[PDB]
Structures are given as structure tokens and as C-alpha cells.
Amino acid sequence: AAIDKLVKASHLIDMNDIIREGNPTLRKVAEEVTFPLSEKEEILGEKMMQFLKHSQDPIMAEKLGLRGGVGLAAPQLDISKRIIAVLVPNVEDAQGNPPKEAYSLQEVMYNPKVVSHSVQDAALSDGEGCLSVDREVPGYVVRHARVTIEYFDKTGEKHRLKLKGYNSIVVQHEIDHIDGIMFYDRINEKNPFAVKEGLLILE
Ligand SMILES: [Zn+2]
Ligand SMILES: [Zn+2]
Ligand SMILES: [Zn+2]
Ligand SMILES: [Zn+2]
Ligand SMILES: [Zn+2]
Ligand SMILES: [Zn+2]
Ligand SMILES: [Zn+2]
Numbered sequence: 001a002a003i004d005k006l007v008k009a010s011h012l013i014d015m016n017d018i019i020r021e022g023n024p025t026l027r028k029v030a031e032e033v034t035f036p037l038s039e040k041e042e043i044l045g046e047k048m049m050q051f052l053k054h055s056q057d058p059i060m061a062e063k064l065g066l067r068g069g070v071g072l073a074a075p076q077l078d079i080s081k082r083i084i085a086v087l088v089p090n091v092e093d094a095q096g097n098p099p100k101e102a103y104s105l106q107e108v109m110y111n112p113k114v115v116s117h118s119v120q121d122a123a124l125s126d127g128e129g130c131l132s133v134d135r136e137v138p139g140y141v142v143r144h145a146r147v148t149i150e151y152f153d154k155t156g157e158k159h160r161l162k163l164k165g166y167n168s169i170v171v172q173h174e175i176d177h178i179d180g181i182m183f184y185d186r187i188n189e190k191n192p193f194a195v196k197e198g199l200l201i202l203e
């Protein structure tokens with residue numbers, strides 16, 4: 001089982017742990033976790049966060065052969081549980097000063113879901129990618145501009161959070177993975193770059 005390989009104390013998640021487009025696990029609805037968490041589930045969360053951390057450190061990323069990334073969902077590791085990790089850094093300013101907060105979003109989320117959202121839609125100008133998808137896929141991935149989410153942390157504490165902009169896009173993309181939805185499911189079928197009036201194009 002994947003879970004045993006991934007939770008071994010010395011194991012670091014890398015690209016070779018990521019399942020590929022076509023693997024049926026990517027299209028399942030992932031199973032809810034129960035609290036208190038098993039050790040495996042707690043460790044998996046930690047390994048997932050560490051993966052993002054490693055991904056974002058140019059030298060660790062070079063060492064492990066990782067591209068930079070801000071999100072990861074358990075189904076991408078062949079684990080059909082509702083566990084996602086998100087790590088969205090703030091950027092340095094023009095003078096090279098680090099931001100006051102390292103991250104605008106940093107969480108391992110258990111059983112996350114969208115509980116409400118804006119009528120307005122948004123999409124990243126540059127489109128979206130996927131660690132599991134080894135194809136070029138152009139177009140606007142159309143999502144909710146703003147969302148309210150609930151989730152539980154590793155302790156079982158419930159959180160409720162409003163998200164907008166890029167962080168909104170990120171959590172939606174991850175939650176989609178745990179529902180068996182892929183980014184290109186949300187790209188217009190006739191014209192990948194169609195803009196419905198009022199769509200927020202995010203720079
Ligand atoms: Zn591995
Ligand atoms: Zn069940
Ligand atoms: Zn722990
Ligand atoms: Zn490390
Ligand atoms: Zn609620
Ligand atoms: Zn709705
Ligand atoms: Zn993804």
C-alpha cells in the first residue's frame with residue numbers, strides 16, 4: 001500500500017510518488033477522515049507539507065528533482081482520503097526585502113469543503129498545471145472568485161475561512177482533487193480562452 005511507503009520515517013515525497021493522469025484514484029470521491037487521526041494520516045499530512053516546503057526551496061528542489069508548487073492533495077499520492085496541503089508564499093518587494101509574513105496561506109486541511117462562494121467567477125491568466133498531467137493544456141480554468149471554506153486541522157479543531165484572489169484558486173484546485181475533478185474539466189470546450197463578461201482574470 002502507498003500509505004506505508006509514504007509514512008516511513010526516512011521517506012521524502014518526490015515526483016515518483018505522484019500518480020499519473022489516467023490512474024482511477026484521481027477520479028474517485030476521496031473518503032472523509034475521522035478524528036482522532038491515525039498516526040498514518042497525521043504523518044501523511046506532515047510529509048505533504050514538507051513536500052511543498054522542499055519544492056519551494058531551490059536547492060532542496062534541485063536535490064529532489066522537484067518543481068515549485070503551492071498545493072498537493074492525497075489522491076495525487078494514490079491515497080483516497082480528503083487531505084490537502086497548501087503553501088502560498090508572499091513575495092519579496094522590489095528592494096529584495098522578505099515579506100512580513102512568509103506565507104499568505106499555510107495549512108494541512110482535513111475534510112475541506114466549499115460552504116459558500118461568490119456569484120462572480122475568476123481564472124488565472126496563465127492557466128493551471130498539474131503534477132499528474134504531462135501534457136500542455138491551454139486555457140482559462142474557470143472557478144469561483146471568492147469562497148468560504150471549512151476544514152479541520154490535524155488536532156480535529158474546525159476552521160472557517162474566507163478566501164479570495166490566488167489563495168481562493170489554490171484551495172479550489174486542491175478540493176477538486178479530493179472530489180475526483182481535474183483542472184481541465186473547468187476549461188471551456190469550444191474556446192479555451194473564452195471570457196464571459198465579468199470574469200476576473202487574475203494576473
Ligand atoms: Zn518516494
Ligand atoms: Zn465512508
Ligand atoms: Zn506529528
Ligand atoms: Zn526538509
Ligand atoms: Zn458550516
Ligand atoms: Zn453554489
Ligand atoms: Zn493538482
Ligand SMILES: [Zn+2]
Pocket residue numbers: 114117144
Ligand atoms: Zn463550486
Ligand SMILES: [Zn+2]
Pocket residue numbers: 184185187188189
Ligand atoms: Zn474538455
